[PDB]
Short mmCIF file of C-alpha atoms and ligand atoms in Angstrom, two decimals:
data_model
loop_
_atom_site.label_atom_id
_atom_site.label_comp_id
_atom_site.label_asym_id
_atom_site.label_seq_id
_atom_site.Cartn_x
_atom_site.Cartn_y
_atom_site.Cartn_z
CA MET A 1 0.00 0.00 0.00
CA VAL A 2 0.84 3.67 -0.48
CA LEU A 3 -0.38 6.64 1.52
CA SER A 4 -0.80 9.97 -0.23
CA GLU A 5 0.96 13.07 1.00
CA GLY A 6 -2.32 14.34 2.47
CA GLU A 7 -2.70 11.25 4.64
CA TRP A 8 0.91 11.52 5.81
CA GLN A 9 0.20 15.15 6.68
CA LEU A 10 -2.80 14.22 8.84
CA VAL A 11 -0.66 11.54 10.57
CA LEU A 12 2.29 13.84 11.32
CA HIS A 13 0.07 16.73 12.35
CA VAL A 14 -1.45 14.63 15.14
CA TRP A 15 1.91 13.11 15.96
CA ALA A 16 3.32 16.57 16.51
CA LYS A 17 0.93 16.96 19.40
CA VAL A 18 1.83 13.55 20.81
CA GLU A 19 5.47 14.59 20.96
CA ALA A 20 4.58 17.47 23.29
CA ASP A 21 4.31 14.75 25.97
CA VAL A 22 6.02 11.54 24.87
CA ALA A 23 6.12 9.96 28.33
CA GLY A 24 2.44 10.66 29.09
CA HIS A 25 1.24 9.20 25.79
CA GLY A 26 3.43 6.07 26.00
CA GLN A 27 2.09 5.27 29.45
CA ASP A 28 -1.58 5.78 28.47
CA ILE A 29 -1.08 3.58 25.43
CA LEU A 30 0.68 0.70 27.18
CA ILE A 31 -1.80 0.79 30.06
CA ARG A 32 -4.74 0.76 27.64
CA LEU A 33 -3.16 -2.21 25.86
CA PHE A 34 -2.65 -4.19 29.09
CA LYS A 35 -6.16 -3.47 30.39
CA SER A 36 -7.89 -4.22 27.09
CA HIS A 37 -5.85 -7.37 26.40
CA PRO A 38 -4.29 -8.67 29.60
CA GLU A 39 -2.74 -11.58 27.73
CA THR A 40 -0.24 -9.16 26.22
CA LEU A 41 1.08 -8.31 29.68
CA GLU A 42 2.39 -11.85 30.04
CA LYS A 43 4.93 -11.31 27.27
CA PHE A 44 6.76 -8.74 29.38
CA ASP A 45 8.76 -10.46 32.13
CA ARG A 46 9.53 -6.93 33.40
CA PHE A 47 5.87 -5.89 33.94
CA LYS A 48 4.24 -9.32 34.50
CA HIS A 49 3.83 -8.58 38.21
CA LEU A 50 1.78 -5.38 37.92
CA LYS A 51 -1.76 -6.13 39.09
CA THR A 52 -3.67 -2.84 38.90
CA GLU A 53 -3.80 0.33 36.78
CA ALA A 54 -2.49 2.18 39.81
CA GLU A 55 0.55 -0.06 39.94
CA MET A 56 1.13 0.57 36.23
CA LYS A 57 0.74 4.32 36.57
CA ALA A 58 3.29 4.25 39.37
CA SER A 59 5.95 2.24 37.53
CA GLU A 60 8.85 4.41 36.29
CA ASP A 61 10.17 1.44 34.30
CA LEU A 62 6.92 1.13 32.36
CA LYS A 63 6.94 4.85 31.57
CA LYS A 64 10.56 4.50 30.33
CA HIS A 65 9.54 1.63 28.04
CA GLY A 66 6.62 3.68 26.69
CA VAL A 67 9.03 6.50 25.71
CA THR A 68 11.19 3.85 24.01
CA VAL A 69 8.16 2.47 22.15
CA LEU A 70 6.81 5.81 20.90
CA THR A 71 10.26 7.08 19.93
CA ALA A 72 10.86 4.05 17.72
CA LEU A 73 7.36 4.46 16.22
CA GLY A 74 7.75 8.17 15.68
CA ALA A 75 10.97 7.66 13.69
CA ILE A 76 9.17 5.15 11.52
CA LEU A 77 6.14 7.34 10.83
CA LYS A 78 8.40 10.21 9.93
CA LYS A 79 9.97 8.06 7.17
CA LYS A 80 6.60 8.24 5.37
CA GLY A 81 6.72 4.70 4.03
CA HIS A 82 10.50 4.50 3.54
CA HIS A 83 11.10 2.52 6.74
CA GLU A 84 12.79 -0.70 5.60
CA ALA A 85 15.95 -0.27 7.64
CA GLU A 86 14.14 0.82 10.81
CA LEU A 87 11.84 -2.15 10.48
CA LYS A 88 14.34 -5.07 10.34
CA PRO A 89 15.97 -5.01 13.77
CA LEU A 90 12.52 -4.41 15.24
CA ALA A 91 10.92 -7.37 13.52
CA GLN A 92 13.89 -9.55 14.35
CA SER A 93 13.79 -8.92 18.12
CA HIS A 94 10.03 -9.18 18.33
CA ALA A 95 9.85 -12.34 16.20
CA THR A 96 12.70 -14.37 17.62
CA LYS A 97 13.67 -12.85 20.98
CA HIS A 98 10.35 -11.69 22.47
CA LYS A 99 8.11 -14.14 20.60
CA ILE A 100 5.36 -11.69 19.78
CA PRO A 101 2.41 -12.87 17.64
CA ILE A 102 1.25 -10.71 14.77
CA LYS A 103 -2.16 -10.30 16.46
CA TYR A 104 -0.67 -8.35 19.35
CA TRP A 105 0.52 -5.71 16.85
CA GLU A 106 -3.11 -5.05 15.97
CA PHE A 107 -3.96 -4.79 19.65
CA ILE A 108 -1.34 -2.06 20.26
CA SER A 109 -2.58 -0.36 17.06
CA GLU A 110 -6.06 -0.19 18.57
CA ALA A 111 -4.70 1.29 21.79
CA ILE A 112 -2.82 4.02 19.93
CA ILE A 113 -5.93 5.12 18.09
CA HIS A 114 -8.05 5.02 21.23
CA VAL A 115 -5.60 7.26 23.06
CA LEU A 116 -5.15 9.79 20.25
CA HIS A 117 -8.91 9.98 19.89
CA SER A 118 -9.36 10.61 23.61
CA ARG A 119 -6.58 13.18 23.91
CA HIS A 120 -6.71 14.93 20.48
CA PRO A 121 -10.31 14.90 19.24
CA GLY A 122 -9.76 18.22 17.51
CA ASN A 123 -6.88 16.83 15.42
CA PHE A 124 -8.21 13.32 15.19
CA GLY A 125 -11.39 13.51 13.13
CA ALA A 126 -12.67 10.67 10.93
CA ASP A 127 -10.30 11.56 8.10
CA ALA A 128 -7.24 11.82 10.36
CA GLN A 129 -8.16 8.56 12.04
CA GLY A 130 -8.48 6.78 8.70
CA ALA A 131 -5.04 8.09 7.77
CA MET A 132 -3.49 6.92 11.06
CA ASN A 133 -5.17 3.56 10.61
CA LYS A 134 -3.76 3.25 7.06
CA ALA A 135 -0.28 4.13 8.34
CA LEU A 136 -0.43 1.47 11.07
CA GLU A 137 -1.84 -1.13 8.72
CA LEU A 138 1.01 -0.39 6.30
CA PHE A 139 3.40 -0.86 9.21
CA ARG A 140 1.83 -4.13 10.45
CA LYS A 141 1.75 -5.72 7.04
CA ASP A 142 5.43 -4.91 6.54
CA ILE A 143 6.18 -6.38 9.96
CA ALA A 144 4.20 -9.47 8.98
CA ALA A 145 6.14 -9.91 5.75
CA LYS A 146 9.42 -9.67 7.69
CA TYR A 147 8.21 -12.26 10.23
CA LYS A 148 7.66 -14.62 7.32
CA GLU A 149 11.13 -14.05 5.93
CA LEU A 150 12.61 -14.50 9.43
CA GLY A 151 10.79 -17.81 9.75
CA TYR A 152 8.23 -16.94 12.42
CA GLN A 153 4.93 -15.67 10.95
CA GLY A 154 2.40 -16.05 13.74
C1 HEM B 201 4.18 -0.01 17.85
C2 HEM B 201 4.71 -1.28 18.23
C3 HEM B 201 5.95 -1.47 18.90
C4 HEM B 201 7.15 -0.82 18.91
C5 HEM B 201 7.57 0.41 18.10
C6 HEM B 201 8.02 -1.53 19.83
C7 HEM B 201 9.33 -1.17 20.02
C8 HEM B 201 10.11 -1.83 20.94
C9 HEM B 201 11.49 -1.47 21.19
C10 HEM B 201 12.20 -0.31 20.49
C11 HEM B 201 11.96 -2.32 22.13
C12 HEM B 201 13.39 -2.40 22.68
C13 HEM B 201 14.44 -3.03 21.73
C14 HEM B 201 13.96 -4.34 21.10
O1 HEM B 201 13.82 -5.31 21.89
O2 HEM B 201 13.74 -4.33 19.88
C15 HEM B 201 10.88 -3.21 22.49
C16 HEM B 201 11.04 -4.26 23.38
C17 HEM B 201 9.99 -5.10 23.65
N1 HEM B 201 8.76 -5.16 23.03
FE1 HEM B 201 8.08 -3.92 21.64
N2 HEM B 201 7.32 -2.56 20.42
C18 HEM B 201 6.08 -2.59 19.82
C19 HEM B 201 5.07 -3.51 20.01
C20 HEM B 201 5.24 -4.55 20.90
C21 HEM B 201 4.20 -5.53 21.14
C22 HEM B 201 2.91 -5.61 20.33
C23 HEM B 201 4.60 -6.28 22.20
C24 HEM B 201 4.00 -7.25 23.06
C25 HEM B 201 2.56 -7.45 23.05
C26 HEM B 201 6.00 -5.93 22.45
C27 HEM B 201 6.77 -6.60 23.37
C28 HEM B 201 8.06 -6.20 23.62
C29 HEM B 201 8.90 -6.83 24.62
C30 HEM B 201 8.52 -8.07 25.43
C31 HEM B 201 10.04 -6.09 24.71
C32 HEM B 201 11.16 -6.20 25.74
C33 HEM B 201 10.92 -5.52 27.10
C34 HEM B 201 12.08 -5.56 28.07
O3 HEM B 201 12.97 -4.70 27.91
O4 HEM B 201 12.05 -6.45 28.95
N3 HEM B 201 6.34 -4.87 21.65
N4 HEM B 201 9.75 -2.87 21.78
#
């Protein structure tokens, strides 16, 4: 797939607001993911023990990881489709070190959109949301193709 420049512009406009508070958004997103789909929490040996939202909010380690997650994602979105090199080490660790099924990538995609919609309704209308969804689909399908090449696909 190919996004048009207009769709990229809606994606990076919203993303510019996210970057005003990278730590805050990464924590909201990860927490939303773990509440909505608790099974994903089990893949993180580091966070496995957190039992409540309050424990998650309080974890400095979790907020650090969220900053790490959104920074890697930001650098990919800013490539506007040209993200081959950024993608490979990411797919390799998640496929063969962390053992992450493809399905969980959709789950975090869902969380991202929920959070942007709650925090940026003015900059996250129907059109901007369709653009963000297209960008994350594009991303997921490229991750899925790399999984396959790496011998995982699952
Ligand atoms: C937008 C999607 C995501 C991005 C950009 C992302 C990025 C990263 C980065 C940059 C790291 C650290 C270096 C590495 O191991 O490659 C990491 C580690 C990790 N990721 Fe992801 N991640 C994403 C989605 C996921 C998903 C869907 C899961 C699990 C449901 C996941 C599980 C993990 C685990 C288990 C670690 C290691 C945590 C630790 O340090 O103990 N990631 N992620």
